[PDB]
Structure formats: C-alpha cells, structure tokens
Ligand binder design. Sequence first.
Ligand code: ACP
Ligand code: ACP
Ligand code: MG
Ligand code: MG
Lengths: 494, 494
Amino acid sequence: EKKYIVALDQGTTSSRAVVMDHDANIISVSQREFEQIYPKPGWVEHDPMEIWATQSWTLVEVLAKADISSDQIAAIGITNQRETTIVWEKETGKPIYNAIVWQCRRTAEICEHLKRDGLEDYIRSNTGLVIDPYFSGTKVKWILDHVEGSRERARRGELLFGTVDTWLIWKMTQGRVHVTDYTNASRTMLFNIHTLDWDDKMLEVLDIPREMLPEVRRSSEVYGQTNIGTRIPISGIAGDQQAALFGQLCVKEGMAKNTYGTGCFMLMNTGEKAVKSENGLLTTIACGPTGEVNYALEGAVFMAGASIQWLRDEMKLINDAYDSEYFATKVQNTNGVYVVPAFTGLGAPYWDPYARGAIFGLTRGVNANHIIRATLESIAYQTRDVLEAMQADSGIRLHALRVDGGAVANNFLMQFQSDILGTRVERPEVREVTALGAAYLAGLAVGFWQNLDELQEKAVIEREFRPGIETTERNYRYAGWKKAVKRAMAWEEH
Amino acid sequence: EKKYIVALDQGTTSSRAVVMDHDANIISVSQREFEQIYPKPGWVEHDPMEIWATQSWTLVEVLAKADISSDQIAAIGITNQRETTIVWEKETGKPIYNAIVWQCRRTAEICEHLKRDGLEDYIRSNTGLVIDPYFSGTKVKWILDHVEGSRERARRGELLFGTVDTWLIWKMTQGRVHVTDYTNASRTMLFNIHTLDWDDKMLEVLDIPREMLPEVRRSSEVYGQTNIGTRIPISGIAGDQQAALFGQLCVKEGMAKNTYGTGCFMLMNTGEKAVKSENGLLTTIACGPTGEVNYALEGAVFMAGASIQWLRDEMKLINDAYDSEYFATKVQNTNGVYVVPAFTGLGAPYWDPYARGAIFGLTRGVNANHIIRATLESIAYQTRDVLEAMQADSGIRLHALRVDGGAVANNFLMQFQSDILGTRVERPEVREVTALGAAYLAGLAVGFWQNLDELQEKAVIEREFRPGIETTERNYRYAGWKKAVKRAMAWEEH
Ligand SMILES: Nc1ncnc2c1ncn2[C@@H]1O[C@H](COP(=O)(O)OP(=O)(O)CP(=O)(O)O)[C@@H](O)[C@H]1O
Ligand SMILES: Nc1ncnc2c1ncn2[C@@H]1O[C@H](COP(=O)(O)OP(=O)(O)CP(=O)(O)O)[C@@H](O)[C@H]1O
Ligand SMILES: [Mg+2]
Ligand SMILES: [Mg+2]
C-alpha cells in the first residue's frame, strides 16, 4: 500500500521536500525560496512563518505534483539549517521575533563577556563547542533580554523555544509535541553531550528558563503524527549536516564527508566517543547507524558557495555560479592572487570574528578571471586547512575524501581540491545526500528499512578525483595561502 | 613664416604630439596608445619600436590634421616617461631588449646587494636618489649581465644606452645626436647631481661602460635638426613630471604641483639649493625660471589613474574612466573597504618593492561600487602620505595644493582629495600643463618666447576645492588607510 517516504528540508535560503520509492529513488521534488533578512550588517533573520509556509507548500506540491496520496507514504524524515533559533508564544503559537540564523553575528558582544570569565573549557568541554555567535545559546539570550515579558512568560512556561526542526514540528503536530534531536540539540551550546542533556551551567549562565526547552529525542524515532490527510509519521530528525553525513552513510568511526554548500562542513565519525578538538574543530553529536547518538568531529567554514554568489550577485563578474568554471579555466592559474572569504570573519580552524574578506597579490595584468578562480581555490584551501586539524585531532589518514554539495558539480573545483589535499576525492552518484539521511533515518525508524546495507547501493560513487600536482606544487600554494589568511585576520577593530 | 611649436610627449601608455600658437594655444593633438608588456608579475616592458613608431606618428597627424607644414613650426619640445631604459645596437640601430619601465620591479635583488654593500648614503647623496628598482642604473645592468656580448660591444662602444628622450632623438636625428638633459639624466641613479656628470662610483660599481652613455645637456638648448621635411629643431627636454612643473610655472622655492596621471608625482621647487629627504622623498633636478637647473623635492606614486584603467580594462567594472565618478557617488561611502594599488610595489614614502595590490575589509554587502570608490579614494590617501613628507622635508605648510593631470577632471576625487588633506585644491584652467612646459623650454630655447611672464597669464585657476570634512573623519580614515598599507607591505617572497 504505502510506497513512499517524505524528506523535508528546511535550508538556509529555501524550503524543500522530497519523495522516494523503497528502492530509495527520488520520486520527486518541491522547492520554495524564502527571504534572506539582513536587518543590519552581520545580521540575519528569517520569517519563522516564511520558513514554515514555504516548506508546507513544498510538502504538498509534491503529493499532488506526482499524484501520491497520504495513504502511500510511510513517514516523514526532517532536516535543517542549524543554529537558527526560534521562540514563540505558544497559546498564540506565534513568534515573538524572526529567527536568527547561525549566520548572524549580532551576538558577538556576549561572546566576549563569556569569554573573559574563562568559560572556554567548560563550553569547549561540555558542548564540544567553542565561544562564538555561531551557536544559539547567545542568540536566545539576545532575545530574552531584548524582549519584555519574555523571561517571565518564559519562566511561567508561557514562551517556547525551538530550532528550525523544533519549530517545524510543533506546527505539523499542531503544538502537540515539543522535541528536538541530539544532533540538533547539540548545536545550541547549552547541552551536555556526554550527558545528553540541557546544562544548568549554561542554562543559568546564559540565563534561560528550563521551561521553553523541548524534549530532546533520538534522531531515528517516532515523535508523532501529522494530519496532512490521514495521519503521517515523523520519525526523522538531524541537522542537515548530520543528515548528509548519514545520507552519505558515514556511519562508523573515520567515515567522513565534505559538504560544499553555502559554507563548508566537513564532518567525521567517532562513532561512539566524543573526541576533543585540540586544533579548533568541533566535537559534536551525530547519528549512529540506527538514529542513535554518535560523535563527530566537525570543521565548519563560513564562506563557500556564498563567495561565488557574491561574485555573481554583488560583484557581478558572472551570471551563473555555473559560469565560474568556464572563466576559471580561461586562465592558466590565479596569477599570484589569493582571496580570503572572511566576509563573516573566520572559523574552523581559526575562529577569528574580526577577520574580513580580502583580496591579495595584485598586479597590473591580473583580471576578473584570475579573481574568479582564486575565489574558488579559496574554497579548497579552507577544506585542507581544516582537514589538517581533523587529521591532527583524528590521528587518522584519509586517502579518500567523499564529498557532497552544490559545488561538487564544479569539476575544476573538484579536481583542484584533490590536487590540493593530495587526496583522492569521491563524488557520489546521487546528490540530495542530505534528504537521503532524513528520509532513511525516518523510514529506518519505521522498519521501512531493516538495515542500512540495503540503501548501501545508492552509494555509488560516480567520480573520483585523483591528485595530479606535485608535492612541491602543493605546499607551494598552501604557503602563500596562509600568508594571506594571516593578513586577513583581525581586521575589525576591537 | 613659422607660427608654431610642437611638443612631443612620450608616456607610460601612449605617445602624444601637441601643436600650439604663439599665444600658446593648443592648436592640436595626435595620440596613439602602445602595449603594456607584463612579461611576468611585477614586470613591465615596452617596445622601443612600438614606442618609436607610435611616437613617430602622433606628430605626423597632428601636423596633417591641422594642415600645418614643417615650415611653420619653429621647433620641438620633448617629454617622456622617466625611468624606462633602453639599449641598442647602433650600426644596426636596434634594441637588444625591450624597454624596462620605471614601474618594473625585476631588479630588486640587485638592489638588495647594493643595499648590503652599504651604498645608500653615497647614492642618497650624489644622486638625490634612493635604492630602488625604480631607477635605471640597476635596470641597465640587469640587461647587461643578461645579454651576451654586451659588456664587450658595450665597451667597444658598439652598444648604446638611453632614456625615452635620448632614444627618441637618436631616432629623429637618425643617429646624429646622443644626448639627454639633466632632469632626465638625474633619474638614472648614475649621475652626480652636484657635479652634473656621470659618476664613476656607480659606473663601475654597476659595472657600466662610459661608452654607451649619452651626452648630458641643458633642458632648453638646441640639440639638432629634424628632417621631417625641412629641418626642424629639438630644443627642449624634461621628464614628463618636471615638465609639468614648469608648465604649471612652479618656478621658485615653495612652488608645488601635484600631478595626477598614470602615477602621482607631487613635486616641489627648492631651486638652487637642494634639500635632502628625511622622509623617503627624492631630491631632484628641476628647471629654473630660465630653463636653468633647480632642485626639487619629489614624492612618486606608482599607481594612480592606472588603478582606474585596471578597473576598466582588466577588471572591467566600468567602460569609462569617466564612469568612475558616477558610480562612486552611487554610494554614500566605501563601506570600510580599503584598497592598495601596489601593483608594482610601493614607492614614496614607503619604497617597498615587495608590496602587491590589495583589497581590504570586505563584507557581504560590499559591492562593485564600493570597490570602485575605494580605488579612487586610494588615490587621495597616497597624495596625503606624500605630501606630509613633503612638509616634513620642506619645513612648510601649504595651504593650497595646485594640481594637474588626467584625473583632475574628477571632482569627487578632487573634493575628497581636499577633504582628506585639510587643504585647498586649485584646478587650473589649462590642462596640457605638461606639453605646455616642453613646448615653452623648446621655444624658450629659440627666442620663440623670451620669458614666461608672457605665458604667465595662462595660469588661471578655474576650480577651487575646499575641504568639507571634519578633522576627526580625516584622520579616522587616514588611520584605516595606514592600517591597510601595512598589511600589504612585503607580500612578495624574497
Ligand atoms: N557549478 C557550481 N560551481 C561552483 N559553485 C557553485 C556551483 N553551483 C553552486 N555553487 C554554489 O552552490 C551553493 C548552493 O548549493 P547548495 O544548495 O547545496 O548549498 P546550501 O544547501 O548550503 C544553501 P541552503 O542551506 O540555504 O539550502 C551556492 O552557494 C553557490 O554559490
Ligand atoms: N574621470 C576620471 N576619473 C578617474 N580617473 C581618470 C579620469 N580621467 C582620467 N583618469 C586617469 O587619468 C589618466 C590619463 O591622464 P594622463 O594623460 O595625464 O596620464 P599620463 O600621461 O600622466 C601617464 P601616460 O603619458 O603613460 O598616459 C589615466 O591613467 C586615467 O585612468
Ligand atoms: Mg541544506
Ligand atoms: Mg604623460
């Protein structure tokens, strides 16, 4: 009877929805883009509704657009953008403010405070995190002490708090269930990860009512029913990253994917143990082969695809991300030019909130082409950067990096990236790797699948890139690249 | 009989010819562009021929196009780009290597040598100069020990060496005269300036035959005739900048112009006595009110309009230098972006051959416009940097800066310029301020005039810009500016 599953994806810039057969084949897609709100510089918001509305659309458009009825899909997997915070009136069921995205650097001040009172090691140690406006902790607060009743209503459990997923659910289930998953939970910088629970330290340190917090659940389990009509299940929950990780099947120690989207996220499986980063990476919760807590080593990069949109949208040196390859090849090389994408400051490994984007090594004969390719190169550099750590923290040698994401399409890229890592690179057959998880995980959760090995087939690698440049070559470049970064760091006056 | 005078102006990017009436009016202009060779990054050459040639023309059409005839013009003034070096086969009359442009940084090594054999002072004292790939000494050599027989033929006076002007003449005069003027001579970094003659030290130190050297002369004198046909005369020399010094009439202690063209060249008249730079400026040979030796305090900026062509040609962010102004006003500000034009390394006050161009403080919302503006602004900054020198070396306060060049057309600029200086900016009425001079001198050379109080009236300032920004502001920016420069110094690995 029920021949399908539905992956729901809430992303930084658009809501998506996906259907697949039991052979795990992408039955179809729905996709509505929503408004990137930049209240001011460094700031980002979204319309929690906007987010919502889109997505729901999405969901439906599919049904119909393929003519599947509620009676044929098993359940609902679910993924999302990750740091992005929400709070709302529950009775009312209304937001008392937009959402603030992980992107947003509005919560820098705070960080500083925390900073001084040496809570690094507590945070770093009970969250695998670090101090940064990246994680909600701070955000939430921001609001709290930005809103009037807030803290009260909050306290009197009047107000609610969620995460893209969190929020998402409340909706579906009509305010019935108030949960999250660990992967997601993790993220907040208010949760104990070898504890698997909210964390008084923070909680109070950050000054937040234990009230508005959701019931943090497993990532592959049954949370509730949705009457889309006809009650559909929701047995999926992981942040998109986790999601792609799982969807990329990295589901056992030393398994790692590098994702290439708005920014870059290379995650690594420690399966059962949380390892601590010595080199400015992140320790984070993940999905084990059944929807169960795992650990992971994460390197997060702020600017990746974005550099390219900039390039196209604000710079206008191009019309198409696509185009970037054509031009890049147009030139033999980058002509000594280096580009640092700290539009948002830095990040793994660096975590320099004062770094700004910078262009380097300009000469008279340098042109847009050069600029453009340097921009791309910029992206492998980073990936390496971080990977180094990962090795350093991992105590592991990857001979193959398996990628995924928007840009994995760019062959130039791909190639270059390999040439630079010195490692071989695996470009999978399927591409919606993320949803892939969400879906799985969910269906797995329903014994829609008994095993992963099933789906293990949809993990065909389509292209592996082999390193084709000399070692010299390699470090040659990497050098000037660091040269740069240094010069980029600490731009913003304190 | 003979009603005109023909100025010849060989430039960094284009050959120019100009005609003028005894009332000193630009009868006409011819103008042909020649190719900027970037053999490799930091390197720049020209084709002595394509120089030749293009410079041969302009004259031609400027006659023709105004129907003047050899028999109506009196003589020929000559101005050129200054450091650019040439050397050729005489018999044959051919270059054994493209022209190395003052702007070219290929002889930095050498410089470094010179540096550690402790010859600053001597240089810095006999030359007015500084150790920098800017001056020719180093260049010649480069060649020398770079070509095969060279030094020999060199030695058996088989080879010839000159500067733009020198080269030019030889040409015209089909190999009859081998000379140059002081202004131009100065520039080599192989000429004693309180001595007015080639300087052995240098000569051998640099290891350069006294042969291939041209006869050094007075900037206003009669070197010989041209059979453009109909023998015409050549009675003036000067380097492009110094020319404009004159043709702006800065002809007494404290007279100071700031030119605005490919680069920036703010000079300042000392006259008879010759100040010594304490702050990274140059001491050079100027033209006295009678076409008789003077001294100057010169700051030299490498990139200035040039940055704008780039913007235009290579980057392509505009189609018209003109367009800059528009776009720039299109934004309230530069949104913190700062830009540094070391496409050829630095220069006064700095002198860092290893600086490379750079952009700074890029944020997400920064755009082409901002970029663009920053590039212009970049121009002003510089001018200030130098001017400070100028003061700190002059022990003088200018309350007004009289400019000139291509870009003075830009008012934004100008405005900004003044706002940054905290001083007023005088835009004259006439613009070929340069050719002007060259023309003078050449005819002043021939009684085609018989003093400048004549011409004097042509010095009408049309536009006056007055500082419209507060003090704070002023330095507030200067500051980040500096903050920027630093980060750009020493990019290049030596
Ligand atoms: N062919 C190509 N070559 C190079 N870069 C490309 C590319 N196609 C896309 N890019 C980049 O890919 C990104 C979009 O891909 P993708 O959707 O996977 O990222 P993403 O999912 O993080 C955005 P969200 O999280 O808001 O859904 C853009 O940032 C764009 O600049
Ligand atoms: N409207 C404008 N805005 C900005 N820059 C401008 C401009 N108009 C001209 N410029 C700049 O002015 C220069 C042209 O003027 P100019 O003839 O004085 O150069 P130049 O002769 O001093 C060195 P060359 O002899 O090699 O040309 C160019 O470098 C150009 O980029
Ligand atoms: Mg996504
Ligand atoms: Mg010129």
